[PDB]
Amino acid sequence: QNQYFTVQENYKERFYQIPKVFFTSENYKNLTNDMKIAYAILRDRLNLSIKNSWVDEDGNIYFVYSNEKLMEILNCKKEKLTKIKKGLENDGLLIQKRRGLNKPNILYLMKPIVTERDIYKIEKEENDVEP
Amino acid sequence: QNQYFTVQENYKERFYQIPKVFFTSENYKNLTNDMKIAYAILRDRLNLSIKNSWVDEDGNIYFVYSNEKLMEILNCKKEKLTKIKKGLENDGLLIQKRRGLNKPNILYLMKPIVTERDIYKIEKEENDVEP
Amino acid sequence: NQYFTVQENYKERFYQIPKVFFTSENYKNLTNDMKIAYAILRDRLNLSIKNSWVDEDGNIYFVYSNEKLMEILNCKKEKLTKIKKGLENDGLLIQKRRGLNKPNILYLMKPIVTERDIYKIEKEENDVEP
Amino acid sequence: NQYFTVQENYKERFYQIPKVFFTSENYKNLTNDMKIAYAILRDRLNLSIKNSWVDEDGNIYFVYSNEKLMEILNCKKEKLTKIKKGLENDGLLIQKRRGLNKPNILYLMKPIVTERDIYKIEKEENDVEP
Numbered sequence A, B: 001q002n003q004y005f006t007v008q009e010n011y012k013e014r015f016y017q018i019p020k021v022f023f024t025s026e027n028y029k030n031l032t033n034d035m036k037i038a039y040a041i042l043r044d045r046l047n048l049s050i051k052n053s054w055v056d057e058d059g060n061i062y063f064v065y066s067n068e069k070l071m072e073i074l075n076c077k078k079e080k081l082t083k084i085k086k087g088l089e090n091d092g093l094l095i096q097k098r099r100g101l102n103k104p105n106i107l108y109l110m111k112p113i114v115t116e117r118d119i120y121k122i123e124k125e126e127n128d129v130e131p
Numbered sequence C, D: 001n002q003y004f005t006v007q008e009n010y011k012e013r014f015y016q017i018p019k020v021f022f023t024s025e026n027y028k029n030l031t032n033d034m035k036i037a038y039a040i041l042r043d044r045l046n047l048s049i050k051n052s053w054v055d056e057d058g059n060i061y062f063v064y065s066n067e068k069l070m071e072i073l074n075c076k077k078e079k080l081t082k083i084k085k086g087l088e089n090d091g092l093l094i095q096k097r098r099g100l101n102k103p104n105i106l107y108l109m110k111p112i113v114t115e116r117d118i119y120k121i122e123k124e125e126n127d128v129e130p
Helices: A007-012 A033-051 A067-074 A078-090 A116-126 B007-012 B033-051 B067-074 B078-090 B116-126 C006-011 C032-050 C066-073 C077-089 C115-125 D006-011 D032-050 D066-073 D077-089 D115-125
Strands: A015-019 A094-097 A106-109 B015-019 B094-097 B106-109 C014-018 C093-096 C105-108 D014-018 D093-096 D105-108
Touching: A007 B033, A007 D115, A015 A033, A015 D032, A033 A067, A033 A078, A033 A106, A033 B007, A033 D014, A033 D032, A033 D115, A067 A078, A078 A094, A116 D006, A116 D032, B007 C115, B015 B033, B015 C032, B033 B067, B033 B078, B033 B106, B033 C014, B033 C032, B033 C115, B067 B078, B078 B094, B116 C006, B116 C032, C006 D032, C014 C032, C032 C066, C032 C077, C032 C105, C032 D006, C066 C077, C077 C093, D014 D032, D032 D066, D032 D077, D032 D105, D066 D077, D077 D093
Parallel strands: none
Antiparallel strands: A015 D014, A094 A106, B015 C014, B094 B106, C093 C105, D093 D105
């Protein structure tokens, strides 16, 4: 017979999403496990940013989080937060904007870049069947 | 270069989901286009029901909607609402519970049933490549 | 603990209709068949990537015969033409003709989202209670 | 209007880690490698359905050699054993041994969700502002 929609099943199916290209691209080779996971967590927070009207003039969605709050969100210490921020920033996955004395710093999460090698590798992985 | 996460892109990627089995199974052959679409719309509302604490003792998620409200949600007239409700109910996709004089009627959306024929047909469709 | 089951896997396979099809004044003219056919073709986008149906700029397209499209959409020829035209008029489909012998190249298009669309979808998605 | 592009398609391919891995006291012991490896194997669940790796009750399983698992997880043997054991202890993996000649049958398992998990995830998912 049919099954109900259950709250247990609903929360079993909630995820943090790490882009597959983080595992194929040479550009994202330097990323640590924490950097990848933190990137996924921030993406889920993107939906929170849309609720906060944290959308700029061009429709770009951003974060207005203090380092303390980011430490809370990512469950990490201060040094780790700095290392993660730098790692993502250097790979072009995070952009930091300063708005001056009047305002707190803005954080922009960025989509990854995908090359033909990445596409080939992901296709290869996603269609690896047998015999 | 990298792209921002944009609110436009976010809302471009919001969907109503119709189960693929609605198009393969003999049991769901009788369903009209409106029944299928209404089923998808109610599923998105499932997330609203979790926010409303519309979860019963066994964790089953339900609706507490009046016919007027359902008419608003589904954008349909009264006769259409009745036809949709009956069609889904007869196919086991909707269960209606009466709680008496004290309370308004409860609606339970149900997951579809999938048979081996359904699985075969969906596999066939999802892997229909060439040459 | 629970297993991953094939029934649960195929229970969770869907055809996805963009919510804006129900909010925008622009897509008001679309019939139910047009909306569903659009959802079905999008799923087929994944098949097109497997078929190397990708142009120079990375745009994904279809090169299906009308008979094939009739099979995919489970419709007769008249219905197919009506659907193609309906989607085309709303900018959701671009059709290129390669002549009598060959099938048309079809480009499925993303819909347009306006602030009114965004507001109404926000309204729907947060339609909560005390 | 915009095209569907292959870059955008593969930009949107992910490995999914259950949120409860970060809230539950039960999964606190899991390392980052264990969580990621779990996400990767889940994606492989779709490959198992294609391989007819489905048992009598519809449960999806893996029959990959340790060399193959090492390739999939991009790890050495010691790491693989540590990951398998770590997932196994938390009930996220069931391992059946078919002897010296053959690879182990592996059942990936869904996690357990408690009310504390649900509450914390609700708290996270609705962490809004004025």
